[PDB]
Design a protein around this ligand. Structure first.
Ligand SMILES: *[C@@H]1O[C@H](CO)[C@@H](O)[C@H](O)[C@H]1NC(C)=O
Ligand SMILES: *[C@@H]1O[C@H](CO)[C@@H](O)[C@H](O)[C@H]1NC(C)=O
Ligand SMILES: O=Cc1ccc([N+](=O)[O-])cc1
Ligand SMILES: O=Cc1ccc([N+](=O)[O-])cc1
Ligand SMILES: CCOC(=O)CC(C)=O
Ligand SMILES: CCOC(=O)CC(C)=O
Lengths: 269, 269
């Protein structure tokens, strides 16, 4: 059981994370309303939310996502889409840890995520600041599903410190880094990382701890099943780096559980 | 507000329609438990439910589906899959009538449906009759979603009046034939047709009716949104051939609403 308010935020950013796949903005100009196909993001449509910047297949990693102003909730939101085909993207996933000391002292992190962010990091950083300046009063939030979780977590760990909190809401994110990097995220200040996982979603179970990866604490763990609605009572905060009895159990994982975070995500009806 | 029990029947049959797509049926051995991926058919899995006869790409409209034995609910259930990819099925939808006076005289139903049915119709009626025999007190139900709903609602009228009732539960069914057809379906005894609709589903609005199609009465019409759970007070009974106030209304149709009948249907997580 989490608090209602936190349960609301988790839903909200789950729907901003879903809008990265199902909003209509392939080339949608800055200022237009954020709407989705398939009722993927109704809490968003109900706010006065608009794009500040849409992006797609950008830089080295072919990153995709958008920047939203939310007047109703007073947020600036950076939402990163996961992979367009999660099953293949799971299958082509290398386990290669890299040196991350530009971010932190002795932090190992996965090579492709660290890589993709840097490629776009400057062009987007510039674009948060501009809005953070324009609406100094609004909470910055980075969020994302799946790959998107990874990206978001890494941009957040990377752009904090500059005098405005960045909160991160991740959904079914993969492990990002080595136990020190984990540690850096568990303890880092300038914001909170909210690491959300569902049941035996598999993506969070990768890469394996037996390739040295760890999970930043803490974990918010959705127990209710696939296709089941979520209530504040089905979420468990699990304390402790690489803890177990959350998602991190030695039962068999599942891919459907990964596309069910407070509703459909990773896909579009 | 439908009754609790009819509601339970709606759900269960929705789930048998969903199992057409998401079951591990392929051609599995008869007597295997029925199970689905993606939490798609839990009420089926809860029941002592086992395949009797599987089929894949059978006859002259690659009809796919299964025949099931459910000792818990006392059912013999024939469930026909709709199209493997629907939007592509909708696009190439041929609007050609044909005559099937061997069902009702002066009746003309969609050539493509009747034609795929007839081609497999024997082999199945045998398989059903077989199963009615070893389980005489079991209720025979035909079910389906979308073009599976078509086949079920046709294999219906054709196989009725041979001693045994045949209920038909259809979910987002297209029109299947001419107004002569509507009445025969609307009045026919020894089995009642529960034609279920959601919001603006597209598949039920085709064919248009200016190709010469009408709709049987009554209509059961789910008024709750896409990705919203259905309660009893979200279902509305709708009467009169081709009446309106349900799916059949003048607004824009949606593909997504077609994929949400009590849960996810027409697609597998
Ligand atoms: C955008 O939404 C605002 C308020 O949230 C609304 O007033 C306006 O009509 C919308 N624009 C369009 C094109 O719907
Ligand atoms: C099939 O289900 C029955 C009861 O519904 C159960 O007793 C049996 O264990 C199941 N078979 C398998 C292989 O799970
Ligand atoms: O976050 C995914 C999601 C799925 C369905 C819905 N919904 O429409 O309720 C919202 C969000
Ligand atoms: O899956 C539960 C269930 C409950 C009632 C019925 N019925 O009464 O038809 C069928 C299934
Ligand atoms: C092969 C999976 O497709 C993609 O990678 C798309 C993406 C990275 O967003
Ligand atoms: C559009 C109908 O869907 C199909 O079954 C096409 C196929 C892969 O054989």
């Amino acid at each position: 059981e989490v608090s209602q308010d936190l349960f609301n935020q988790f839903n909200l950013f789950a729907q901003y994370s879903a809008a990265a796949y199902c909003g209509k903005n392939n080339d949608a100009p800055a200022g237009t309303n954020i709407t989705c196909t398939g009722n993927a993001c109704p809490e968003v449509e109900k706010a006065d939310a608009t794009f500040l910047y849409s992006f797609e297949d950008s830089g080295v990693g072919d990153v995709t996502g958008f920047l939203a102003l939310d007047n109703t909730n007073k947020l600036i939101v950076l939402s990163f889409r996961g992979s367009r085909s999660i099953e293949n993207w799971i299958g082509n996933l290398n386990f290669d840890l890299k040196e991350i000391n530009d971010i932190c002292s002795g932090c190992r992190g996965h090579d492709g995520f660290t890589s993709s962010w840097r490629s776009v990091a400057d062009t987007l950083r510039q674009k948060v600041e501009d809005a953070v300046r324009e609406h100094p009063d609004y909470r910055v939030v980075f969020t994302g599903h799946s790959l998107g979780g990874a990206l978001a977590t890494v941009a957040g760990a990377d752009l904090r410190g500059n005098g405005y909190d960045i909160d991160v809401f991740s959904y079914g994110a993969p492990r990002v880094g080595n136990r020190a990097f984990a540690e850096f995220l568990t303890v880092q200040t300038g914001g909170t990382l909210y690491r959300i996982t569902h049941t035996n979603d598999i993506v969070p179970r990768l890469p394996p701890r037996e390739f040295g990866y760890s999970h930043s604490s803490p974990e918010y763990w959705i127990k209710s099943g696939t296709l089941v609605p979520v209530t504040r009572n089905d979420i468990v905060k699990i304390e402790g780096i690489d803890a177990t009895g959350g998602n991190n159990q030695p039962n068999i994982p599942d891919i459907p559980a990964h596309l069910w975070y407070f509703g459909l995500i990773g896909t579009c009806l």
